[PDB]
Design a protein around this ligand. Structure first.
Ligand code: PLX
Ligand code: PLX
Ligand code: PEE
Ligand code: PEE
Ligand code: PEE
Lengths: 113, 303, 70, 98, 83, 129, 105, 99, 347, 114
């Protein structure tokens, strides 16, 4: 009676201690991974900015080629009153590109399992 | 080669169900001081094939006035859900890797009652409808406590990812951290699949049987992954696969043992069991497992 | 005796061995002999997309090492 | 406002019209309210996810919960009405008149 | 005292599940307010960097702000390591 | 483009709503609503709302359409509006949903009180007498 | 009608959830956060009538960011003209837009 | 794409097997010759539904434990569980769980 | 029911209304409406009979449809501007959805059909609660967004409500249906001044609540729900019939009674906005309400109807339970016209 | 309203770091220790200007500094680094814990060499 309850409580306490140690170790490992990501972030940000700018410039050049016959069109005209930089929308970067990479950029993370 | 992977996941599960029928018959026979099927096949191994051939050849008794659409749809849904719930599981690497794999499994289990409801309604009999209502009430009642126990246990895993459970139990099994929740989970999985002592209830009949035994094996594998964490070495996953399969087999044989050992409950008795013994303890242990990581500064990593 | 039950169980065990192992082997064949890369949280997805772009063969698993730095 | 939003809005409108028809079977009326709330959940989730408004990720679930609670009450009412007549027909609820 | 003891003994018989559930829930409510490791858990949660630490523009009046992570000034995680 | 999978999902959603809005044989209307709920869950999941889609599909379908069916048986342009950046090493949906306890104390209080009152109200209404 | 109990008591019962740019968890930023911040700072204390008549530029930008209707119109015009030219045969897409480019990290 | 294809394969295999089972014995010729509405089942269904609604709120608890506001989150989680227990107790003491 | 449960449900209804009144987030306003609806149903079904169940199910259907419409309006407003604060809507379609939802919740025409039937089905105390406390939250929301409303739609529904109440009250012998049609007409009067002055809306609401409380408590005291049952009260409680006649005269808008205060003020306000025809029609239509109030007064206190012999036994007993605020309600509903300028208190 | 100005394609041309994410993760800690100053300059400029077009030269600087870091790695201890990254690349989650020994060897080599 008392012995069975004591055995149950004792094994519960042993499990609690073991998982305390293991979970603290896991917290430290996660902090290490986050530190690695933080160290790598600036290079990725630079590459991302440069890639976005290249795609925008390519789309602008193609628009300049295409819109030469439209009377009231202005090439590279913003739709916002503000001069502040606006993060480009997904259709602005992949609008004129091929379907496969449009579907990639749109649903690759969602569909990857 | 994803299709080959899907077939290599599906076909072996159905074969395992077919031979689980034979295993259960032989285990019950030897527990009852007799032999099981040992004539059809060298050691009874041809018995499931003979049963399948006989069932698929025998006339199907369509009620001739029942709802044809639902009468066909119910076994389709049963088999589809039973085969789908194996996709989320990691052995060690899952066929499909889901962020919320546990929640997906819970949602599939929640759907599983529609087959019972539709089969009961289609039979065009008051007594069959009453039995179906009993079954649905029991199933939803016990899936309540299944969900609560599941979230209480997962509060130590750190997320709903089923693979992380392997990382959580790298040193010790989750059975030692929480055995009472595991006991209530085992009883609730017995109740959920309508296995004894909670078993109060041609082609399509075999289809339902296959779905039920697939859910039995699936639930036992889920319990093994959840509470008995097998060690995994990334350069040799065969060790994890063998260990996980052995634990799943042991749990299935434990269902057979429980079937062979006990009488069955009444409907009101199992309703009272759940609603007055499991739910209070489940809520109390849910509070305890919410508080414990904060008290002991042992919160799992992922967020 | 009781071991008369063992054959069928063995068969069942084999049927439970096939899925898991199969996935592992496929995950090595379609991912260049390594574990299939898992992508939660969309940062790992970004790493995979960067590797896929810098591979030059449109496969992320092909790893460009220190020999690619010139 | 793209085509998906208009599709969900017209789904809500169809559910509302179906509720306002009342052929019979008050259970169908409850089903129509239920489809209305489902469309509301879908469109609110789409709007909140698209605009990356992190906090209102709460409100779909809450909406569901509250609407679901409402559903429960409605079912109770339906049941009780049947207990008086043996059927949930709409035309039996004509004791009270203008 | 005596009546409470009689009530607890009478409930521990024929109603052990309810007694256990109420005891466990009461412990789950009370114990966190007394444990000294709760602040440790809060600190561990604070030390988890999910975002990039944006540097501050130096203005000649920031002695406690490091210029490099290796510098002694700045928060440390030795308490975490010793845990 | 995969011929606007989101658009065709929304079209199936509208078709299912038309299907059960005619209200034929309330079991058939319930099944049409179940199909519509599954399609809407697919829409939300394909959009990126994994947790909210699974909440639909679990709570909505497996509980309350189930209770509706139980009670009934007892009786007689896309891809464009999307983002450019990433989320970090976490999912924004989970953090925002997760934030209700830290941020949404008032919401938790009112919702819990409402649910308790709902239990009391159901029992009182079904009391009979 | 509206009894502003929160302002009198300083409670903040539900104001944390009213706007995009109000202290999201983990400092996650709303897509239209910059636009909403400008619209709010334009219209603060000015009153509803003057806010509606005088802060129309910021609200128009905020609305545009939220729904992107004008961007959709421009993109559709570009795609439609490109389709007309390719049907006529006097325009050819470059290798970049056919998937034949050299990708960058 | 993977999940949709897996679902389609599962449903296709189930359908193929059920139809072949339903038509294999159809090739060879053979002979080929109420009210009660008990109230307790509706109540158990509604209780399950009410409980289910409570279950959804907690669902986010695994993620709720990383907030730096551990006191507030713990208080609100315990409040939700206590109110669930109070719902169970009220339905217990009012003969709502009887047959 | 249990008094504890009844008190809990009443406080839950009041807390829902309060939640609607004090919140600044549209979700919290919707939650308050949901809480109010959830706790209101058992109050309507406190006394069990088939008629009360029918009234409760009709009320639930109407209010749930209105709540779904209101949430649709909220989500559309969020779509066209990512705002959750209750203020000007910013969307024409959303405002209409919101206006129809609130009109359905209030009972304004053409969404009036549920009010007479629900009021007839439920008891007198439930009707008092339904016709007094259940108008505060929708009217408060309307006041908060009054700068958004299209005046054409609101004024159309107000005039329709006044006409419908006046015409529908003429055909009634049941007292609860008379109260319901009177409430519809008074709601029509209240919503016609929202586009111009919410203070006049609140003043009309307060005066109407006072008169309705007095009339319902008088009807409960002399436990009558029909004209002929009320015609027997003079043979037991003539003073109650006299007070009821004075209250009915006040409810018809006769000076110098209190009921003249709102319409007068409202008319006055509507004249400052160069609106002449509409107040004229409103007063001419209110003459119908006065007609059926006067018919009730004729049948109750101005003439002596035949009685029965058993009434003699009722002469030997007195009321065990009393309303403390009934005299104050009568006085406030009949004799507050001299204190009209106090409306500057922004009541 | 106005014309959005974009840099020319020549302005965006830079000598790119063409190593995979496994190599980057293997080097990340020492990379953050060594190449910190240009990285912080770039990130401070990036959160202050709120404009990619105003931060391009700092991005070129961080690319150059990363290239210099990897050239130093290549020159002194290519083999130790290669073995360490092979381990990181194998794991699907790219966990540091899985190959501690490889990391230790790499750490000793860099300290002696650099
Ligand atoms: C003061 C007036 C008292 C009388 C009137 C009471 C009215 C009804 C009672 C319900 C209202 C209670 C008010 C609580 C509002 C919540 C907000 C406030 O309390 O602060 C919170 C503090 O929360 C605390 O946990 C309060 C706990 C109280 C709730 C537990 C029991 C509540 C029961 C009340 C009624 C419920 C049903 C009936 C139960 C018997 C937030 O904490 P914090 O994290 O710093 O700030 C978040 C912002 N961050 C993220 C930037 C940091
Ligand atoms: C028909 C007679 C009706 C009488 C009404 C009931 C009388 C008993 C009331 C008990 C005392 C009430 C006073 C409340 C104490 C504090 C008041 C405070 O909380 O509210 C202030 C304001 O209190 C009220 O406004 C004053 C109520 C006084 C009502 C009397 C005027 C009625 C018209 C004249 C008829 C004659 C009546 C006099 C004889 C008794 C500030 O309100 P505010 O948060 O800033 O904005 C909300 C209102 N808005 C939206 C319209 C702007
Ligand atoms: C994967 C692991 C599997 C573990 C379980 C293996 C099963 C072994 C074979 C036996 C199972 C056979 C199944 C048959 C169904 C049996 C179910 C059953 O009877 O349980 C009922 C039983 C009692 O009901 P009744 O006797 O009918 O009376 C109640 C009314 N007065 O219910 C229970 O007791 C449930 C309790 C489950 C275990 C929980 C015990 C924990 C109590 C103390 C724990 C303390 C921990 C708290 C934290 C510590 C902090 C200091
Ligand atoms: C049947 C179950 C349908 C949903 C299965 C998958 C649900 C899920 O949680 O995962 C979706 C999966 C992975 O999500 P995460 O776990 O977040 O990780 C990915 C990011 N690394 O990705 C997907 O969304 C794939 C599917 C999205 C498109 C299709 C969705 C399904 C549509 C079904 C419509 C048919 C409904 C029929 C009626 C149903 C009535 C029961
Ligand atoms: C502060 C913590 C609170 C949170 C913890 C609780 C979480 C879950 C538990 C509560 C669930 C709801 C409980 C509902 C209570 C109803 C009980 C009841 O009515 O049952 C009575 C009988 O049960 C009772 O006696 C009532 C409760 C008895 C006391 C139970 C424990 C009370 C507290 C004990 C411990 C307190 C703290 C620890 C003290 C011990 C030393 C540490 C009748 O039983 P029947 O099945 O209907 O019929 C049987 C007769 N034929």
């Amino acid at each position: 009676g008392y012995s069975m309850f004591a055995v149950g409580i004792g094994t519960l306490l042993f499990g609690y201690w073991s998982m305390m140690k293991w979970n603290r170790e896991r917290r430290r490992l996660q902090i290490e991974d986050f530190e690695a990501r933080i160290a790598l972030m600036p290079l990725f940000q630079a590459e991302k900015d440069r890639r976005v700018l290249q795609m925008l410039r390519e789309n602008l050049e193609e628009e300049a080629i295409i819109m030469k016959d439209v009377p009231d069109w202005k090439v590279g005209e913003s739709v916002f009153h503000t001069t502040r930089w606006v993060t480009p929308m997904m259709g602005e970067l992949y609008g004129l590109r091929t379907n496969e990479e449009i579907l990639s950029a749109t649903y690759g993370f969602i569909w990857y399992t | 080669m994803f299709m080959i992977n899907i077939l290599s996941l599906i076909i072996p599960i159905l074969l395992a169900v077919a031979f689980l029928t034979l295993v259960e018959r032989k285990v019950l026979g030897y527990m009852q001081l007799r032999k099981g099927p040992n004539v059809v096949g060298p050691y009874g191994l041809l018995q499931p094939i003979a049963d399948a051939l006989k069932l698929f050849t025998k006339e199907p008794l369509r009620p001739a006035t029942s709802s044809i659409s639902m009468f066909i749809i119910a076994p389709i849904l049963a088999l589809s859900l039973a085969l789908t719930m194996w996709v989320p599981l990691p052995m060690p690497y899952p066929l499909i890797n889901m962020n919320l794999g546990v929640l997906f499994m819970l949602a599939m289990s929640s759907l599983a009652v529609y087959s019972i409801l539709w089969s009961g309604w289609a039979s065009n009999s008051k007594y069959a409808l009453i039995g179906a209502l009993r079954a649905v009430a029991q199933t939803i009642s016990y899936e309540v406590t299944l969900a609560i126990i599941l979230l209480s246990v997962l509060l130590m895993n750190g997320s709903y990812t089923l693979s992380t459970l392997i990382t959580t139990q790298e040193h010790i099994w989750m059975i030692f951290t929480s055995w009472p929740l595991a006991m209530m989970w085992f009883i609730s999985t017995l109740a959920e699949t309508n296995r004894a002592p909670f078993d109060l209830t041609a082609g399509p009949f075999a289809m339902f049987f296959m779905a039920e035994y697939a859910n039995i094996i699936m639930m036992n594998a889920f319990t093994a992954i959840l509470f008995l964490g097998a060690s995994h070495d990334p350069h040799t996953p065969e060790l994890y696969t063998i260990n996980f399969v052995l634990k799943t087999l042991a749990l299935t044989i434990t269902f057979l043992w429980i079937r062979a050992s006990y009488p069955r409950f009444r409907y009101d008795q199992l309703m009272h069991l759940l609603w007055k013994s499991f739910l209070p303890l489940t809520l109390a242990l849910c509070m305890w497992h919410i508080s414990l990581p904060i008290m002991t500064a042992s919160i799992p990593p992922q967020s | 005796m009781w071991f008369e039950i063992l054959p069928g169980i063995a068969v069942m065990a084999a049927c439970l061995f096939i899925p898991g192992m199969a996935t592992a082997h496929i995950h090595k064949f379609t991912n260049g002999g390594k574990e299939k890369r898992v992508a939660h949280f969309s940062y790992q997805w970004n790493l995979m997309e960067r590797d896929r772009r810098i591979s030059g063969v449109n496969r992320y698993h092909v790893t460009k090492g220190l020999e690619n730095i010139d | 406002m793209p085509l998906v939003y208009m599709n969900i809005i017209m789904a809500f409108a169809i559910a509302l019209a179906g509720l306002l028809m009342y052929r019979s079977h008050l259970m169908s009326s409850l089903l129509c309210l239920e489809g209305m709330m489902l469309s509301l959940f879908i469109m609110s989730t789409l709007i909140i996810l698209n605009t990356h408004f992190t906090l209102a990720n709460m409100m779909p679930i809450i909406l569901l919960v509250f609407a679901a609670c409402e559903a429960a009450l409605g079912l109770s009412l339906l049941v009780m009405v049947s207990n008086t007549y043996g059927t949930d027909y709409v035309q039996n609820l004509n004791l009270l008149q203008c | 005292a005596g009546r409470i003891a009689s009530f607890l003994k009478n409930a521990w018989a024929k109603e052990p599940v309810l007694v256990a559930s109420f005891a466990i829930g009461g412990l789950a409510i009370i114990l966190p307010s007394l444990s000294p490791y709760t602040n440790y858990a809060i600190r561990i949660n604070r030390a988890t960097p999910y975002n990039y630490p944006v540097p501050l523009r130096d203005d000649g009046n920031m002695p406690d702000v490091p210029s490099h992570p290796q510098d002694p000034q700045g928060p440390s995680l030795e308490w975490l390591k010793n845990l | 483009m995969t011929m606007y999978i989101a658009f065709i999902l929304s079209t199936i959603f509208v078709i299912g709503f038309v299907g059960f809005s005619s209200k034929p044989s309330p079991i058939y209307g319930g099944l049409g609503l179940i199909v519509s709920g599954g399609v809407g869950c697919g829409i939300v999941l394909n959009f990126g709302g994994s947790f909210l889609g699974l909440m639909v599909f679990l709570i909505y379908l497996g509980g309350m359409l189930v209770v509706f069916g139980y009670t009934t048986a007892m009786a007689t342009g896309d891809w464009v509006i999307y983002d450019t950046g990433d989320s970090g090493f976490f999912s924004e949906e989970a953090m925002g949903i997760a934030a209700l306890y830290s941020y949404g104390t008032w919401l938790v209080i009112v919702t819990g009180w409402s649910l308790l009152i709902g239990v009391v109200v159901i029992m009182e209404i079904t009391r009979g007498n | 009608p509206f009894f502003d109990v929160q302002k009198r008591l300083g409670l903040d019962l539900d104001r944390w959830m009213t706007i995009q740019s109000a202290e999201q968890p983990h400092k996650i930023p709303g897509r239209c956060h910059a636009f909403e911040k400008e619209w709010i700072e334009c219209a603060h204390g000015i009153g509803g009538i003057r806010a509606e008549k005088e802060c129309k530029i910021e609200f128009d930008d905020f609305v545009e960011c939220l729904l992107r209707q004008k961007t959709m119109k421009r993109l559709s015009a570009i795609k439609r003209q490109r389709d007309k030219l390719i049907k006529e045969g006097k325009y050819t897409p470059p290798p970049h837009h056919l998937g034949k480019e050299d990708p960058r990290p | 794409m993977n999940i949709m294809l897996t679902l389609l394969t599962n449903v296709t295999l189930a359908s193929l097997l059920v139809l072949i089972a339903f038509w294999l014995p159809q090739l060879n010729a053979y002979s080929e010759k109420r009210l009660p509405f008990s109230m307790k089942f509706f109540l158990v269904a509604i209780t399950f539904l009410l409980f289910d609604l409570e279950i959804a709120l907690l669902l986010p608890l695994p993620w709720a434990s990383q907030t730096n506001n551990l006191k507030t989150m713990l208080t609100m989680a315990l409040f939700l569980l206590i109110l669930l227990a109070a719902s169970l107790a009220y339905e217990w003491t009012q003969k709502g769980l009887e047959w | 029911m249990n008094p504890i449960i009844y008190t809990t449900l009443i406080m839950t209804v009041m807390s829902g209304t309060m939640l609607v009144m004090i919140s600044s987030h549209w979700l919290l306003i919707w939650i308050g409406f949901e809480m109010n609806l959830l706790a209101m149903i058992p109050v309507l079904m406190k006394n069990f009979n088939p008629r009360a169940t029918e009234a409760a199910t009709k009320y639930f259907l109407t209010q749930a449809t209105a709540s779904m419409m209101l949430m649709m309006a909220i989500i559309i407003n969020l779509l066209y501007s990512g705002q959750w604060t209750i203020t000007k809507m910013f969307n024409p379609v959303a405002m209409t959805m919101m206006t129809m939802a609130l009109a359905m919740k209030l009972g304004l025409s053409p969404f009036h059909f549920w009010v007479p039937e629900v009021t007839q089905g439920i008891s007198l105390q439930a009707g008092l609660l339904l016709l007094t406390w259940q108008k505060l939250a929708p009217l408060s929301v309307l006041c908060q967004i009054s700068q958004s409303i299209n005046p054409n739609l609101m004024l159309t529904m107000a005039m329709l409500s006044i006409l419908i109440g006046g015409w529908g009250g003429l055909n009634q012998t049941q007292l609860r249906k008379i109260m319901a049609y009177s409430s519809i007409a008074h709601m029509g009067w209240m919503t016609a001044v929202l586009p111009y002055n919410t203070t006049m809306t609140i003043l009309n609401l307060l005066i109407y609540i006072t008169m309705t409380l007095a009339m319902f408590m008088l009807l409960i005291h002399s436990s009558a729900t029909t004209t002929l049952s009320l015609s027997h009260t003079w043979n037991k409680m003539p003073v109650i019939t006299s007070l009821m006649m004075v209250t009915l005269l006040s409810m018809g808008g006769l000076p110098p009674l209190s009921g003249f205060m709102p319409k007068w003020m409202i008319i006055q306000e509507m004249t400052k906005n160069e609106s002449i025809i509409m107040p004229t029609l409103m007063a001419m239509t209110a003459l119908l309400n006065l007609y059926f109030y006067m018919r009730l007064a004729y049948s109750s206190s101005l003439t002596m109807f035949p009685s029965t012999n058993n009434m003699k036994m009722k002469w030997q007993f007195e009321h065990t339970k009393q309303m403390k605020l009934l005299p104050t309600m009568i006085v406030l509903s009949t004799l507050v016209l001299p204190m009209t300028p106090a409306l500057s208190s922004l009541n | 309203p106005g014309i959005v100005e974009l840099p020319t394609l020549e302005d965006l041309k830079v000598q790119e770091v063409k190593v995979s994410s496994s190599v980057l993760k293997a080097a990340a800690h020492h990379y953050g220790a060594q190449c910190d100053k240009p990285n912080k300059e770039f990130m401070l400029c990036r959160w202050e200007e709120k404009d990619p077009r105003r931060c391009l030269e700092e991005g070129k600087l961080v690319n150059q500094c990363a290239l210099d870091f990897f050239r130093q790695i290549k020159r002194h201890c290519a083999e130790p680094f290669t073995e360490y990254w092979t381990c990181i690349d194998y794991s699907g989650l790219q966990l540091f814990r899985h190959c501690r020994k490889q990391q230790a060897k790499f750490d000793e080599c860099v300290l002696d060499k650099l």
